[PDB]
């Protein structure tokens, strides 16, 4: 067992992901990058599904995967790039 | 299931292959940071698995998979 996949941690992870997704949508992305965003949104939706069915392990894996997708996009766009 | 030892071990092998193959192609400086981070998180997963922390190990490897898969999606062999 581990508190990393408890309900409140997953809820906060989701809130954090949704913030970064809005941040990435605030800038110009290539079509390929937009497809990464869409995949991250799909995995956000999956994380919520598993959380709601009480499967915290799968929920946690989905939101961390989505965070990896999104964090990579953030890293490819230095805030001082433009 | 997804975080059982057998599954994490397979994830770790699969990711090593994906990263060795990604780290030999033309990458931008920013992409190099992402690759480095994925390798670091793979290493973290390996460590936590050794200690029997399956949830922690699983989180590290799925995060690293997301980092890596994003780059794969930006480098389709046929871009179209």
PDB file of C-alpha atoms in Angstrom:
ATOM      1  CA  UNK A   1       0.000   0.000   0.000  1.00  0.00           C
ATOM      2  CA  UNK A   2       1.050   3.600  -0.551  1.00  0.00           C
ATOM      3  CA  UNK A   3      -0.560   7.034  -0.154  1.00  0.00           C
ATOM      4  CA  UNK A   4       0.530   7.982  -3.688  1.00  0.00           C
ATOM      5  CA  UNK A   5      -2.625   6.333  -5.046  1.00  0.00           C
ATOM      6  CA  UNK A   6      -5.117   7.347  -2.340  1.00  0.00           C
ATOM      7  CA  UNK A   7      -8.244   9.184  -3.426  1.00  0.00           C
ATOM      8  CA  UNK A   8      -7.124  12.624  -2.300  1.00  0.00           C
ATOM      9  CA  UNK A   9      -3.710  12.332  -3.971  1.00  0.00           C
ATOM     10  CA  UNK A  10      -5.288  11.203  -7.253  1.00  0.00           C
ATOM     11  CA  UNK A  11      -7.825  14.047  -7.071  1.00  0.00           C
ATOM     12  CA  UNK A  12      -5.036  16.578  -6.624  1.00  0.00           C
ATOM     13  CA  UNK A  13      -2.990  14.938  -9.408  1.00  0.00           C
ATOM     14  CA  UNK A  14      -5.994  15.379 -11.712  1.00  0.00           C
ATOM     15  CA  UNK A  15      -6.344  19.018 -10.722  1.00  0.00           C
ATOM     16  CA  UNK A  16      -2.638  19.539 -11.432  1.00  0.00           C
ATOM     17  CA  UNK A  17      -2.859  17.824 -14.835  1.00  0.00           C
ATOM     18  CA  UNK A  18      -5.856  19.897 -15.833  1.00  0.00           C
ATOM     19  CA  UNK A  19      -3.863  23.071 -14.992  1.00  0.00           C
ATOM     20  CA  UNK A  20      -0.905  22.023 -17.129  1.00  0.00           C
ATOM     21  CA  UNK A  21      -3.214  21.033 -19.991  1.00  0.00           C
ATOM     22  CA  UNK A  22      -4.783  24.477 -19.938  1.00  0.00           C
ATOM     23  CA  UNK A  23      -1.311  25.971 -19.865  1.00  0.00           C
ATOM     24  CA  UNK A  24      -0.247  24.025 -22.928  1.00  0.00           C
ATOM     25  CA  UNK A  25      -3.429  24.971 -24.775  1.00  0.00           C
ATOM     26  CA  UNK A  26      -2.502  28.629 -24.137  1.00  0.00           C
ATOM     27  CA  UNK A  27       0.318  28.379 -26.678  1.00  0.00           C
ATOM     28  CA  UNK A  28       0.718  27.376 -30.300  1.00  0.00           C
ATOM     29  CA  UNK A  29       1.314  23.630 -30.654  1.00  0.00           C
ATOM     30  CA  UNK A  30       1.969  21.570 -33.760  1.00  0.00           C
ATOM     31  CA  UNK A  31      -0.719  19.140 -34.917  1.00  0.00           C
ATOM     32  CA  UNK A  32       1.447  16.286 -33.616  1.00  0.00           C
ATOM     33  CA  UNK A  33       1.669  17.951 -30.200  1.00  0.00           C
ATOM     34  CA  UNK A  34      -2.089  18.507 -30.182  1.00  0.00           C
ATOM     35  CA  UNK A  35      -2.482  14.758 -30.645  1.00  0.00           C
ATOM     36  CA  UNK A  36      -0.317  14.242 -27.532  1.00  0.00           C
ATOM     37  CA  UNK A  37      -2.658  16.590 -25.649  1.00  0.00           C
ATOM     38  CA  UNK A  38      -5.634  14.585 -26.815  1.00  0.00           C
ATOM     39  CA  UNK A  39      -4.027  11.345 -25.625  1.00  0.00           C
ATOM     40  CA  UNK A  40      -3.350  12.955 -22.233  1.00  0.00           C
ATOM     41  CA  UNK A  41      -7.018  13.991 -22.034  1.00  0.00           C
ATOM     42  CA  UNK A  42      -8.041  10.424 -22.854  1.00  0.00           C
ATOM     43  CA  UNK A  43      -5.837   9.123 -20.016  1.00  0.00           C
ATOM     44  CA  UNK A  44      -7.224  11.791 -17.679  1.00  0.00           C
ATOM     45  CA  UNK A  45     -10.686  10.491 -18.510  1.00  0.00           C
ATOM     46  CA  UNK A  46      -9.489   6.927 -17.915  1.00  0.00           C
ATOM     47  CA  UNK A  47      -7.930   7.873 -14.563  1.00  0.00           C
ATOM     48  CA  UNK A  48     -11.263   9.319 -13.447  1.00  0.00           C
ATOM     49  CA  UNK A  49     -13.115   6.171 -14.562  1.00  0.00           C
ATOM     50  CA  UNK A  50     -10.855   3.868 -12.565  1.00  0.00           C
ATOM     51  CA  UNK A  51     -10.961   6.150  -9.529  1.00  0.00           C
ATOM     52  CA  UNK A  52     -14.742   6.147  -9.644  1.00  0.00           C
ATOM     53  CA  UNK A  53     -14.826   2.341  -9.854  1.00  0.00           C
ATOM     54  CA  UNK A  54     -12.401   2.109  -6.890  1.00  0.00           C
ATOM     55  CA  UNK A  55      -9.370   0.785  -8.797  1.00  0.00           C
ATOM     56  CA  UNK A  56      -6.771   3.190  -7.444  1.00  0.00           C
ATOM     57  CA  UNK A  57      -3.764   1.420  -8.921  1.00  0.00           C
ATOM     58  CA  UNK A  58      -5.006   1.673 -12.502  1.00  0.00           C
ATOM     59  CA  UNK A  59      -6.286   5.191 -11.855  1.00  0.00           C
ATOM     60  CA  UNK A  60      -2.857   6.263 -10.591  1.00  0.00           C
ATOM     61  CA  UNK A  61      -1.078   4.677 -13.562  1.00  0.00           C
ATOM     62  CA  UNK A  62      -3.360   6.501 -15.974  1.00  0.00           C
ATOM     63  CA  UNK A  63      -2.869   9.923 -14.421  1.00  0.00           C
ATOM     64  CA  UNK A  64       0.915   9.491 -14.153  1.00  0.00           C
ATOM     65  CA  UNK A  65       1.067   8.401 -17.778  1.00  0.00           C
ATOM     66  CA  UNK A  66      -0.968  11.488 -18.735  1.00  0.00           C
ATOM     67  CA  UNK A  67       1.367  13.663 -16.648  1.00  0.00           C
ATOM     68  CA  UNK A  68       4.362  12.230 -18.486  1.00  0.00           C
ATOM     69  CA  UNK A  69       2.785  13.021 -21.842  1.00  0.00           C
ATOM     70  CA  UNK A  70       1.975  16.561 -20.742  1.00  0.00           C
ATOM     71  CA  UNK A  71       5.216  17.272 -18.884  1.00  0.00           C
ATOM     72  CA  UNK A  72       7.181  16.337 -21.980  1.00  0.00           C
ATOM     73  CA  UNK A  73       5.249  18.948 -23.992  1.00  0.00           C
ATOM     74  CA  UNK A  74       5.948  21.527 -21.284  1.00  0.00           C
ATOM     75  CA  UNK A  75       9.663  20.696 -21.436  1.00  0.00           C
ATOM     76  CA  UNK A  76       9.680  21.121 -25.215  1.00  0.00           C
ATOM     77  CA  UNK A  77       8.339  24.627 -24.784  1.00  0.00           C
ATOM     78  CA  UNK A  78      10.578  26.771 -22.625  1.00  0.00           C
ATOM     79  CA  UNK A  79       8.425  29.606 -21.333  1.00  0.00           C
ATOM     80  CA  UNK A  80      10.960  32.070 -22.793  1.00  0.00           C
ATOM     81  CA  UNK A  81      10.985  30.399 -26.250  1.00  0.00           C
ATOM     82  CA  UNK A  82       9.024  33.009 -28.231  1.00  0.00           C
TER      83      UNK A  82
ATOM     84  CA  UNK B   1      -1.886  -6.663 -11.903  1.00  0.00           C
ATOM     85  CA  UNK B   2      -0.504  -3.651 -13.811  1.00  0.00           C
ATOM     86  CA  UNK B   3       1.880  -3.126 -10.884  1.00  0.00           C
ATOM     87  CA  UNK B   4       2.797  -6.744 -10.208  1.00  0.00           C
ATOM     88  CA  UNK B   5       6.491  -7.594 -10.376  1.00  0.00           C
ATOM     89  CA  UNK B   6       6.286  -9.507 -13.642  1.00  0.00           C
ATOM     90  CA  UNK B   7       4.495  -6.639 -15.354  1.00  0.00           C
ATOM     91  CA  UNK B   8       6.819  -3.936 -14.054  1.00  0.00           C
ATOM     92  CA  UNK B   9       9.837  -5.991 -15.138  1.00  0.00           C
ATOM     93  CA  UNK B  10       8.422  -6.256 -18.651  1.00  0.00           C
ATOM     94  CA  UNK B  11       7.585  -2.541 -18.709  1.00  0.00           C
ATOM     95  CA  UNK B  12      11.190  -1.762 -17.687  1.00  0.00           C
ATOM     96  CA  UNK B  13      12.687  -3.906 -20.437  1.00  0.00           C
ATOM     97  CA  UNK B  14      10.355  -2.452 -23.060  1.00  0.00           C
ATOM     98  CA  UNK B  15      11.187   1.095 -22.032  1.00  0.00           C
ATOM     99  CA  UNK B  16      14.939   0.503 -22.068  1.00  0.00           C
ATOM    100  CA  UNK B  17      14.621  -0.594 -25.702  1.00  0.00           C
ATOM    101  CA  UNK B  18      12.448   2.358 -26.625  1.00  0.00           C
ATOM    102  CA  UNK B  19      14.880   4.824 -25.009  1.00  0.00           C
ATOM    103  CA  UNK B  20      18.092   3.345 -26.449  1.00  0.00           C
ATOM    104  CA  UNK B  21      16.433   3.635 -29.866  1.00  0.00           C
ATOM    105  CA  UNK B  22      15.239   7.182 -29.168  1.00  0.00           C
ATOM    106  CA  UNK B  23      18.572   8.373 -27.770  1.00  0.00           C
ATOM    107  CA  UNK B  24      20.390   7.507 -31.015  1.00  0.00           C
ATOM    108  CA  UNK B  25      18.272   9.616 -33.394  1.00  0.00           C
ATOM    109  CA  UNK B  26      18.448  13.358 -34.078  1.00  0.00           C
ATOM    110  CA  UNK B  27      16.914  15.029 -31.044  1.00  0.00           C
ATOM    111  CA  UNK B  28      16.631  18.700 -30.147  1.00  0.00           C
ATOM    112  CA  UNK B  29      18.182  20.004 -26.927  1.00  0.00           C
ATOM    113  CA  UNK B  30      14.727  20.053 -25.344  1.00  0.00           C
ATOM    114  CA  UNK B  31      14.052  16.469 -26.420  1.00  0.00           C
ATOM    115  CA  UNK B  32      17.366  15.443 -24.864  1.00  0.00           C
ATOM    116  CA  UNK B  33      16.109  16.767 -21.533  1.00  0.00           C
ATOM    117  CA  UNK B  34      12.944  14.673 -21.894  1.00  0.00           C
ATOM    118  CA  UNK B  35      14.968  11.542 -22.736  1.00  0.00           C
ATOM    119  CA  UNK B  36      17.239  12.166 -19.756  1.00  0.00           C
ATOM    120  CA  UNK B  37      14.218  12.545 -17.504  1.00  0.00           C
ATOM    121  CA  UNK B  38      12.671   9.325 -18.818  1.00  0.00           C
ATOM    122  CA  UNK B  39      15.922   7.451 -18.167  1.00  0.00           C
ATOM    123  CA  UNK B  40      16.045   8.898 -14.661  1.00  0.00           C
ATOM    124  CA  UNK B  41      12.475   7.851 -13.933  1.00  0.00           C
ATOM    125  CA  UNK B  42      13.149   4.394 -15.346  1.00  0.00           C
ATOM    126  CA  UNK B  43      16.071   4.182 -12.913  1.00  0.00           C
ATOM    127  CA  UNK B  44      13.772   5.303 -10.091  1.00  0.00           C
ATOM    128  CA  UNK B  45      11.293   2.577 -11.050  1.00  0.00           C
ATOM    129  CA  UNK B  46      14.081  -0.018 -10.987  1.00  0.00           C
ATOM    130  CA  UNK B  47      15.075   1.121  -7.493  1.00  0.00           C
ATOM    131  CA  UNK B  48      11.575   1.072  -6.042  1.00  0.00           C
ATOM    132  CA  UNK B  49      10.893  -2.342  -7.536  1.00  0.00           C
ATOM    133  CA  UNK B  50      14.024  -3.664  -5.823  1.00  0.00           C
ATOM    134  CA  UNK B  51      12.653  -2.415  -2.502  1.00  0.00           C
ATOM    135  CA  UNK B  52       9.238  -3.989  -3.105  1.00  0.00           C
ATOM    136  CA  UNK B  53       7.448  -0.648  -3.466  1.00  0.00           C
ATOM    137  CA  UNK B  54       5.271  -1.683  -6.387  1.00  0.00           C
ATOM    138  CA  UNK B  55       2.931   1.303  -6.488  1.00  0.00           C
ATOM    139  CA  UNK B  56       5.824   3.752  -6.362  1.00  0.00           C
ATOM    140  CA  UNK B  57       7.777   1.795  -8.988  1.00  0.00           C
ATOM    141  CA  UNK B  58       4.683   1.633 -11.203  1.00  0.00           C
ATOM    142  CA  UNK B  59       4.131   5.369 -10.973  1.00  0.00           C
ATOM    143  CA  UNK B  60       7.723   6.021 -11.998  1.00  0.00           C
ATOM    144  CA  UNK B  61       7.576   3.721 -15.013  1.00  0.00           C
ATOM    145  CA  UNK B  62       4.192   4.937 -16.280  1.00  0.00           C
ATOM    146  CA  UNK B  63       5.436   8.522 -15.966  1.00  0.00           C
ATOM    147  CA  UNK B  64       8.564   7.605 -17.942  1.00  0.00           C
ATOM    148  CA  UNK B  65       6.377   5.845 -20.536  1.00  0.00           C
ATOM    149  CA  UNK B  66       4.351   9.031 -20.976  1.00  0.00           C
ATOM    150  CA  UNK B  67       7.484  11.110 -21.435  1.00  0.00           C
ATOM    151  CA  UNK B  68       8.806   8.622 -23.988  1.00  0.00           C
ATOM    152  CA  UNK B  69       5.567   7.987 -25.870  1.00  0.00           C
ATOM    153  CA  UNK B  70       5.108  11.720 -26.377  1.00  0.00           C
ATOM    154  CA  UNK B  71       8.410  11.826 -28.231  1.00  0.00           C
ATOM    155  CA  UNK B  72       7.472   8.777 -30.272  1.00  0.00           C
ATOM    156  CA  UNK B  73       4.282  10.589 -31.343  1.00  0.00           C
ATOM    157  CA  UNK B  74       6.404  13.503 -32.585  1.00  0.00           C
ATOM    158  CA  UNK B  75       8.684  11.200 -34.606  1.00  0.00           C
ATOM    159  CA  UNK B  76       6.474   8.902 -36.666  1.00  0.00           C
ATOM    160  CA  UNK B  77       8.570   7.160 -39.300  1.00  0.00           C
ATOM    161  CA  UNK B  78       5.995   8.290 -41.884  1.00  0.00           C
ATOM    162  CA  UNK B  79       5.062  11.796 -40.788  1.00  0.00           C
ATOM    163  CA  UNK B  80       2.130  12.381 -43.128  1.00  0.00           C
TER     164      UNK B  80
END
